[PDB]
């Protein structure tokens, strides 16, 4: 997994690859790692995939209720505080490593979070097995006062570094841009540089190839009238 977060002029961008693995085997080739905590607060997760997904939805649920209770749009610092206290209580047993980004009435924010509960602030961050490849690109090309177009370019370039150089990462680049005073734009499969080539042969079988012992209709309908 490769995930990054990059601050720019009027907001923040996060990105991620789309490969999920089970040991050396690729379980899903087009996985969605960019999660929504609230409309304008998004996070990307590395580590135990069920934990990142579950902890995001729990805090996202409680954030929604909090927003309704207070009649205010949710803040990134609230999501951060709730995430870190939950993760600290479970002493690292919930294996969620997250980059949390978003915009709120206070401004634009970018944080990272580690399974034990420690948090970090930054203008640029990376997490996952491909984080070193990504951070190499970020440390080479990041500057202050990036534009929206420059930040999207830098973020996706950092994910590409993970895709090509880290075996734990691959396939496509997902991006989400959160700009102040605008709707957050989720760009699913922003880049697609890994389409499989046409196979040499068709493996469609002639009908009747498989030996069959018994056939029967399965009743999926409910008990009938009359």
């Amino acid at each position: 997994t490769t995930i990054v977060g990059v601050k720019f002029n009027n907001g923040v961008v996060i990105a991620a690859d789309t490969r999920s693995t089970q040991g050396p085997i690729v379980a899903d080739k087009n996985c969605a790692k960019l999660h929504r905590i609230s409309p304008k607060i998004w996070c990307a997760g590395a580590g135990t995939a069920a934990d990142t997904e579950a902890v995001t939805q729990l805090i996202g649920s409680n954030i929604e209720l909090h927003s309704l209770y207070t009649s205010r749009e949710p803040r990134v610092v609230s999501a951060l505080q709730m995430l870190k206290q939950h993760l600290f209580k479970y002493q690292g047993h919930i294996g969620a490593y997250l980059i949390v980004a978003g915009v709120d009435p206070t401004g634009s924010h970018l944080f990272s979070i580690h399974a034990h509960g420690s948090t970090d602030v930054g203008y640029y961050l990376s997490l996952g097995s491909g984080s070193l490849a990504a951070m190499a690109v970020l440390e080479s090309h990041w500057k202050q006062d990036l534009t929206k177009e420059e930040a999207i370019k830098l973020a996706s370039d950092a994910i590409q570094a993970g895709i090509w150089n880290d075996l734990g990462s691959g396939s496509n680049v997902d991006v989400c841009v959160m700009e102040i005073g605008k709707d957050a734009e989720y760009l699913r499969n922003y880049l697609t540089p890994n389409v499989r080539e046409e196979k040499q042969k068709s493996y469609k079988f002639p009908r009747g190839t498989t030996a069959v012992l018994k056939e029967s209709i399965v009743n999926i309908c409910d008990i009938q009238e009359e």
Partner: peptide, 14 residues
């Protein structure tokens, strides 16, 4: 309203 909002999450959406 507070209880109704919460129960929509705890007993259904979650």
């Amino acid at each position: 309203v507070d209880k109704s909002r919460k129960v929509a999450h705890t007993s259904y959406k979650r």
